[PDB]
Amino acid sequence: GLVPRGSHMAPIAQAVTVSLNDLKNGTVSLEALEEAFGPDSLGILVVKDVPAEFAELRHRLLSYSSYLGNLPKSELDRLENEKAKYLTGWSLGKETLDNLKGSYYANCAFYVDPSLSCAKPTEEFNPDNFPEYLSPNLWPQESTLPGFKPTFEDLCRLIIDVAVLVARACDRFAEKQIAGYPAGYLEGVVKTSTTTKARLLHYFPEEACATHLDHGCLTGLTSAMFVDEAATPPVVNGSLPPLGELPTSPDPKAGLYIKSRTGQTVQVKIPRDCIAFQTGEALERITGGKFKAVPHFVRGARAEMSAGRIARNTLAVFTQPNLGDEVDMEQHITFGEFARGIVAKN
Ligand SMILES: Cc1cn([C@H]2C[C@H](O)[C@@H](CO)O2)c(=O)[nH]c1=O
Numbered sequence: 001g002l003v004p005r006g007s008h009m010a011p012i013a014q015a016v017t018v019s020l021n022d023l024k025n026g027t028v029s030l031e032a033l034e035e036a037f038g039p040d041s042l043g044i045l046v047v048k049d050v051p052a053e054f055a056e057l058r059h060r061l062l063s064y065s066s067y068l069g070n071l072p073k074s075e076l077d078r079l080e081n082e083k084a085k086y087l088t089g090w091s092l093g094k095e096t097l098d099n100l101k102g103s104y105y106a107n108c109a110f111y112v113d114p115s116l117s118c119a120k121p122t123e124e125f126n127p128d129n130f131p132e133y134l135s136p137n138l139w140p141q142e143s144t145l146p147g148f149k150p151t152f153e154d155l156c157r158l159i160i161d162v163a164v165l166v167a168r169a170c171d172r173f174a175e176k177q178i179a180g181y182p183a184g185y186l187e188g189v190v191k192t193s194t195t196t197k198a199r200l201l202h203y204f205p206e207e208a209c210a211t212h213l214d215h216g217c218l219t220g221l222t223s224a225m226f227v228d229e230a231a232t233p234p235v236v237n238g239s240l241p242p243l244g245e246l247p248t249s250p251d252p253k254a255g256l257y258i259k260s261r262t263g264q265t266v267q268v269k270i271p272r273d274c275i276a277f278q279t280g281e282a283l284e285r286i287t288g289g290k291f292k293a294v295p296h297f298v299r300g301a302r303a304e305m306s307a308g309r310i311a312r313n314t315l316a317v318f319t320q321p322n323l324g325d326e327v328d329m330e331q332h333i334t335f336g337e338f339a340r341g342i343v344a345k346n
């Protein structure tokens, strides 16, 4: 038991917050960055003052999560990819304490070259030996879900642009603190990655080890959108209007929970107008543990509060290295090796 059972609430903790303006001009405090990402931290950084288009893109794409999740089964079955371990396209998963959640995954190779559906395959790295990273994206039909693909790409591009600036700040820290560190490494790794993976998640309405570490470098996050799908039906019926976002969460216990090295778990909120970034294990390895991936988990809304009508939508963008990039620069372990569980090499 990490969080109190029943109606009792965990304390809420404030994440370190910086302005995108300071990320862009290179004046973000490295003290604040270490407070956000260091060994005693929550492993999360909130970025405010985001581009003006963010609010609408978030609203549209999180609405698409509901529309997508309610497409006829014949359409969703075409988006399933078992060879990719369901890490490309659509699939159904479950969360127990008892919520059903549909996931849609896409690689973000398009960030580097908009014509790419996935990394260019090689003998060393291809869909047959790394299907969970290198399989081609599977998109819903434009006629049945109009505008989904450009909206998805535009919001992911915005979030990755910000991730590149966060990575640049991390590089400033590492260049000051780590002897022999390659200047500009994390910025280059994020900016050129064709393995970065985005996940659009839809919690279906329901009637009345817990933590993980992210594996990549920096995970961009939106705040969650709750939708009353009885009031605004998630049915594609001119442009496609967004669905109604509930102003306030129906369940104050839903959300993100982080267990710092203090051993106790706190709830952490993302302001609706902000983007947050969590550190992952690859960034921890690249910084030799000077920044840490911090254990955490997400809870959906309890069925009593969903009341068979309220769905929950989120976007996460797992920026991470190309498979051949080193993550342990002493032992020369690559991200692909690291992903296959290799922890030592000689
Ligand atoms: C699918 C995926 C998940 N993650 C995060 C969320 C998962 O719960 C965790 C372990 O895979 O890492 C990544 O960092 N990269 C990915 O490609």
Ligand SMILES: [Mn+2]
Binding pocket: 212, 213, 214, 296
């Ligand atoms: Mn996570």
